[PDB]
Design an enzyme around this catalytic site. Structure first.
Site: not given
Ligand SMILES: Nc1ncnc2c1ncn2[C@@H]1O[C@H](COP(=O)(O)OP(=O)(O)O)[C@@H](O)[C@H]1O
Ligand SMILES: [Mg+2]
Lengths: 11, 337
Positions: B19-23, B25, B27, B137
């Protein structure tokens, strides 16, 4: 729900 | 589901989709085989740099502290099999179908929807500010959404308690924040809510700056350039005041003319949110009382919250910075409590 709830979305 | 995504968690879980990919997190939705419940699991690798661990700790403490309809619910955190083998944190939460960025970009929302979405956002913001917590944020991707239109705020790691780092997206950053070294304020969160509301009316970011200068230029181009000393009182940094006096002298753009089809009550609320002077910017509570939201406003169902002392984020205040190992123990305490 609690009253005039908006139409549901298609997600 | 991306085979490269690996979660060191109980085999009782079965990853479903990324569902989500970042440096910071990652998900994914996942199925808890034994019960059949489908949940959301956020993976974090907090121990390569203190900064990552501090964010993890702040996010977990906030999640566990609030029990509010518009604040994403945390079901549990996975317990590592040992302190030695504790390298990732997996925060398990209620699964939402999508986020507001995805919605605003894939769907035509009615005025009713907009009212309901910004209403819920401000409702979460009110309980946060009443607890002396600022999110810092706030943006569409950090607003989780379900089909029935329920909205919940997420990503509380950059929060701060009132009175090298991760930076909030400049497009939603209050101008007093880009200028002065401004002290965390509730008003900065409202400014972001204003950009979000504007984003809902426009279906695109209202202030997409390329960088710092461009951002300021875009903001003043719409809210008008602060000119007199009365207007510049809120700015400390003398350097900052001179930079502002070098900008073109913009009048406040006439929002209702530029966007004639938006509910006038909505433009009114928006204008009160995007005010230069943070002391004159509407509060979350007053925004909930604005005419544009009277359809969903209910003074007896809008949690004000209760004060949280700064020591809640005690670890953020050490003369001698905490080590990775110190934070690992603090995070562990949180998990097993
Ligand atoms: N509980 C959840 N249910 C469904 N999707 C979620 C959930 N939490 C996060 N997401 C998805 O993951 C994205 C990133 O999550 P976020 O918590 O903001 O972490 P990051 O710190 O990586 O930005 C969100 O924009 C959303 O699409
Ligand atoms: Mg986020």
């Amino acid at each position: 729900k609690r009253g005039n709830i908006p139409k549901p979305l298609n997600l | 589901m991306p085979k490269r995504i690996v979660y060191n968690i109980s085999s009782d879980f079965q990853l479903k989709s990324l569902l989500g990919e970042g440096a910071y997190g990652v998900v994914c939705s996942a199925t808890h085989k034994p019960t059949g419940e489908i949940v959301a699991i956020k993976k974090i690798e907090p121990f390569d740099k203190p900064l990552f661990a501090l964010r993890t700790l702040r996010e977990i403490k906030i999640l566990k502290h609030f029990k509010h309809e518009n604040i994403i619910t945390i079901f549990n955190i996975q317990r590592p099999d040992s302190f030695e083998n504790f390298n990732e944190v997996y925060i398990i939460q209620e699964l939402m179908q999508t986020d507001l960025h995805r919605v605003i970009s894939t769907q035509m929302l009615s005025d009713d929807h907009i009212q309901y979405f910004i209403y819920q956002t401000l409702r979460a913001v009110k309980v946060l500010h009443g607890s002396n917590v600022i999110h810092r944020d706030l943006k569409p991707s950090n607003l989780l959404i379900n089909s029935n239109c329920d909205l919940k705020v997420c990503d509380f790691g950059l929060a701060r308690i009132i009175d090298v780092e991760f930076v909030a997206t400049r497009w939603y950053r209050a101008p007093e924040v880009m200028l002065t070294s401004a002290k965390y304020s509730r008003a900065m969160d409202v400014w972001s809510c204003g950009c979000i509301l504007a984003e809902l009316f426009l279906r695109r970011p209202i202030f997409p700056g390329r960088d710092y200068r461009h951002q300021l230029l875009l903001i003043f181009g719409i809210i008008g350039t602060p000119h007199s000393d009365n207007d510049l009182r809120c700015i400390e940094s003398p350097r900052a005041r001179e930079y502002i006096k070098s900008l073109p002298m913009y009048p406040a753009a006439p929002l209702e003319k530029m966007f004639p089809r938006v509910n006038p009550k909505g433009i009114d609320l928006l204008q009160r949110m995007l005010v230069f002077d943070p002391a004159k910017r509407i509060t979350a509570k007053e925004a909930l009382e604005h005419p544009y939201l009277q359809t969903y406003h209910d003074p007896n169902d809008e949690p004000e919250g209760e004060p949280i002392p700064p020591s809640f984020f005690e670890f953020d205040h050490y003369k001698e910075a905490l080590t990775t190992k110190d934070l690992k123990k603090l995070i562990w305490n949180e998990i097993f409590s």
